[PDB]
């Protein structure tokens, strides 16, 4: 028993992290097979970031201007290209530690692990969610760009995020591994504001199920609700609307606990209307929304990775 | 910017995890050089755990009764011994992935990362603290025993915890890697109750510093206090007494922020007396106490590991 905000084991990704330096600028890259993926703004100075013309800045760069270092060993760059907002640096050596992997573009509400790195070296691992406004709430200092987010299914790493930007409000924006930003964000130092940070309703419900499983049940009540009635409260509290698809996804947790999804919605509705009255749920005094239903099932079942 | 509950990169420890089976019972072991460390209750059945005589149960076990598997490859056991509450299984092959390591016995209030494993396979990583009552609040299902807790300084893994028991109240107990339990707990299925779960005051103060650094400052007030006056409030709220040693440890965070330690104590005192009035600090609605001062400095500075 016990329920913790739990990241995937990070070793498979650690083996892929390298340093990339272009002129004055150093950040992180991801070495898979014979390609190193990194943010294209490695080519920019701080000045350039106000108004960069990436294609023009790139003209002045040759393969030998991209210094790529894997631990203590230098990699030879034999080609480079820009794809959307990432550079692909072809090197002459396949990474011997390349895991089975996929590139995935995740949907808002999905969770993933981040391996925060500096100078190609891992500093720590933590769990994030893609927020409904397409930001993430991470921990990224200068030099962390190129750190990645990922999920693992058994033996296969699904990379879903690369870090590129901190907004002035302190939240974080980045791309998939094809270099397309999540949301409307651009790799420019401008006024980019995030929209409403709505709460991921299906994840809160999953977490309430996790609570019940792991002993915390004070919030269960005598009531039920309907999808439309619940969503009238969701809107008021800036929660995502709950859909039939969400109910279906919660089916397995409903079956394990015997608590109908709509009954748990009535519990959540009461918590939103009345607060927690100074009580806690799984050690938190607010409603946690960065566990997916699949996260709850996995952690409560002990699924492992090859 | 951003501040997250952040675990150490887990790869160095992943490479040390093995499966240990004795008769009917399977749990995890830690393979360093040519020794596998695991909980001695691998030799017990569920029945045995009510009242085990470990020395008597061990007499019936030979080297070939301890099945040790590292991924798909079986290790040959050439000797075994019991040290306190762990078994040391000597195998004929040194782990080629052995990192630089130390065994450390930590003090209450110190934090560490846990690599939760099942059947020798990693499932996830998260950050814990040794509570003042010598429990930890983990996420451990049946089969997780032998999972370890650790810290990393650059290239060297300091192992500090091995998981052995879940108390009836759902919190967790275990040993250092010499097999000595933290606190009064024993590897028996009995009535073992945990004492008061007091809050780690110096860690809360460190976390308030982290908040100020990362933008959250609404709780700063016009007041100061003294150690003795603050501790009169600490006692009331089941917080550890703050000592001069603690103040000294917070010195560097005091210097970076310009907020005197005793001024931050006055902020904390107001938060304890008045609550948070429905506000949040670094995304939490309660006072977080599982970040040490060194954790805050590390995460806010971007320290990395070899
Ligand atoms: C990473 C990216 C970054 C790039 C540059 C150069 C001008 C290209 C300067 C500064 C940064 S700072 C940064 C800050 C964060 F909070 C997260 C990621 C980065
Ligand atoms: C791990 C240890 C464990 C051992 C046995 C045998 C009888 C030796 C049975 C059950 C367990 S269950 C367990 C449960 C937890 F929550 C955490 C660790 C273990």
Curated annotation (Swiss-Prot), chains A, B:
It catalyses: TSAVLQ-|-SGFRK-NH2 and SGVTFQ-|-GKFKK the two peptides corresponding to the two self-cleavage sites of the SARS 3C-like proteinase are the two most reactive peptide substrates. The enzyme exhibits a strong preference for substrates containing Gln at P1 position and Leu at P2 position. It is found in: Host cytoplasm; Host Golgi apparatus; Host nucleus. Changing residue 132 to H: In strain: Omicron/BA.1, Omicron/BA.2, Omicron/BA.2.12.1, Omicron/BA.2.75, Omicron/BA.4, Omicron/BA.5, Omicron/BQ.1.1, Omicron/XBB.1.5, Omicron/EG.5.1. The active site is at residues 41, 145. Residues 1-306 form the Peptidase C30 domain. Changing residue 205 to V: In strain: Zeta/P.2. There is a cross-link at residues 5, 90 (Glycyl lysine isopeptide (Lys-Gly) (interchain with G-Cter in ubiquitin)). Changing residue 142 to A: Does not affect ability to cleave and inactivate human TRMT1. Residues 1-306 are cytoplasmic. Inhibited by pyridone-containing alpha-ketoamides compounds 13a and 13b. In turn, alpha-ketoamide 13b (tert-butyl (1-((S)-1-(((S)-4-(benzylamino)-3,4-dioxo-1-((S)-2-oxopyrrolidin-3-yl)butan-2-yl)amino)-3-cyclopropyl-1-oxopropan-2-yl)-2-oxo-1,2-dihydropyridin-3-yl)carbamate) inhibits SARS-CoV-2 replication in human lung cells. Inhibited ex vivo by michael acceptor inhibitor N3. Inhibited ex vivo by compound 11a and 11b. Changing residue 90 to R: In strain: Beta/B.1.351. It comes from the Viruses. Cleaves the C-terminus of replicase polyprotein at 11 sites. Recognizes substrates containing the core sequence [ILMVF]-Q-|-[SGACN]. Cleaves and inactivates human TRMT1, preventing tRNA guanine(26)-dimethylation of tRNAs. May cleave human NLRP1 in lung epithelial cells, thereby activating the NLRP1 inflammasome pathway. May cleave human GSDMD, triggering alternative GSDME-mediated epithelial cell death upon activation of the NLRP1 inflammasome, which may enhance the release interleukins 1B, 6, 16 and 18. Also able to bind an ADP-ribose-1''-phosphate (ADRP). 3CL-PRO exists as monomer and homodimer. Only the homodimer shows catalytic activity. Interacts with host FBXO22; this interaction promotes the proteasomal degradation of nsp5. This is 3C-like proteinase nsp5. It comes from Severe acute respiratory syndrome coronavirus 2 (2019-nCoV). The gene is rep.
